[PDB]
Ligand binder design. Structure first.
Ligand SMILES: Nc1nc2c([nH]c(=O)n2[C@H]2C[C@H](O)[C@@H](COP(=O)(O)OP(=O)(O)OP(=O)(O)O)O2)c(=O)[nH]1
Ligand SMILES: [Ca+2]
Ligand SMILES: [Ca+2]
Ligand SMILES: [Cl-]
Ligand code: NA
Length: 327
DNA sequence: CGGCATACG
DNA sequence: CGTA
DNA sequence: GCCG
């Protein structure tokens, strides 16, 4: 078992679902307390279990796995012995956990805002709706649309939506393309939102595209919310339903074709996979990775990539298709 | 012990 | 601060 | 919380 998640395949479905879920509750709780280091360790330990070829049945099977020390091992031990880990259950039922989860799920609310609201004594969505002058415009939209946004987006909804985005994109810039990224590209049958990456095969033609796309989608009556030069838009969109519609979150991002493989890689995720890939790049290869490129700070040069395959090759990693990046 | 990804709106 |  |  290699130490970095980007060095091993992680499928979407696996053989240690209950154990990984438990560790991820502790990760999430660590994040609510601003403990990013402990969040990372618990996430990494969970991901290791996702990468195993069979179920963990005995404590000795953790021997030598990376990211399993005293704490993560005791969590697995208790689950294996009793079907339950008392620490995890105590977190699950804490008012702090439940409220921080509720608040941070709102579009426009992060951990820092949720925490402040918590310290002010706020506990429920109706507590937030009573004092709406305290909310940003983004938070107001998040709160109004919270119920629809809490419902998973189905993969079967996505093609119709991609077609409406493609129509708007084609008018904004003929020849521009739309690629489905995120968890759906990794094989997920549901997600909390849809992610589209937009480019054009002629370098430079994509400059100024996103505002033109957004104005057209808004003219079609499809945009319930958006922030508005820019290149990422975090939208709420009107998705058709039988006799009606529902609000869904859609992310749109533009990249020049030169950057497209880096953007595709980044936006395809998973989040842990990307953090691990960027950590690997910098710490093991001395190269700086982001969704725009890969930089050699000694040479002061950017690596040209025509494909995700190029990027794994420039990092000395075995290629993983999107379906094996579910770290 | 230091480090923990790295951007844009 | 929020967002990916 | 864990590695290196
Ligand atoms: N949410 C999130 N995504 C990030 C971050 N950094 C980063 O590179 N990404 C990449 C990894 C994600 O897989 C990708 C798209 O984000 P997402 O939240 O829509 O995640 P997803 O498609 O995998 O999940 P879901 O919609 O199925 O719930 O963006 C981050 O801080 N938060
Ligand atoms: Ca998504
Ligand atoms: Ca998204
Ligand atoms: Cl970036
Ligand atoms: Na939020």
């Amino acid at each position: 078992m290699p130490a970095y998640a980007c060095q091993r395949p992680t499928p979407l479905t696996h053989h240690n679902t209950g154990l990984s879920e438990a560790l991820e509750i502790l990760a999430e709780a660590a994040g609510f307390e601003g403990s990013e280091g402990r969040l990372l360790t618990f996430c990494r330990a969970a991901s290791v279990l996702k990468a195993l070829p069979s179920p963990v049945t005995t404590l000795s099977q953790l021997q030598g796995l990376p990211h399993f020390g005293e704490h993560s091992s005791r969590v697995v031990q208790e689950l294996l012995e009793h079907g339950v880990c008392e620490e995890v259950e105590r977190v699950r039922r804490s008012e702090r956990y439940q409220t921080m989860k509720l608040f941070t799920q709102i579009f426009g609310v992060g951990v820092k805002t949720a925490d402040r609201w918590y310290r002010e004594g706020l506990r429920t969505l109706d507590d937030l709706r009573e004092q709406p002058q305290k909310l940003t415009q983004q938070q107001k939209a998040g709160l109004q649309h919270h119920q629809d946004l809490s419902t998973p987006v189905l993969r079967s909804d996505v093609d119709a939506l991609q077609q409406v985005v493609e129509e708007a994109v084609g008018q904004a810039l003929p020849g521009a393309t739309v690629t489905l990224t995120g968890g759906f590209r990794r094989g997920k049958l549901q997600g909390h939102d849809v992610d589209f990456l937009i480019t054009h095969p002629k370098e430079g033609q994509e400059a100024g595209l996103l505002p033109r796309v957004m104005c057209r989608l808004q003219d079609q009556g499809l945009i319930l919310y958006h922030q508005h030069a820019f290149e990422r838009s975090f939208c709420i969109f009107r998705l058709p339903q039988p006799g009606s519609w529902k609000a869904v979150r859609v992310d749109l991002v533009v990249a020049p074709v030169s950057q497209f493989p880096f953007a595709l890689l980044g936006w395809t995720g998973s989040k842990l996979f990307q953090r691990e890939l960027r950590r690997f790049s910098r710490k093991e290869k001395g190269l700086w990775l982001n969704s725009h490129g890969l930089f050699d700070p000694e040479q002061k040069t950017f690596f040209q990539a025509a494909s995700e395959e190029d990027i794994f090759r420039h990092l000395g990693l075995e290629y993983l298709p999107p379906e094996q990046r579910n770290a």
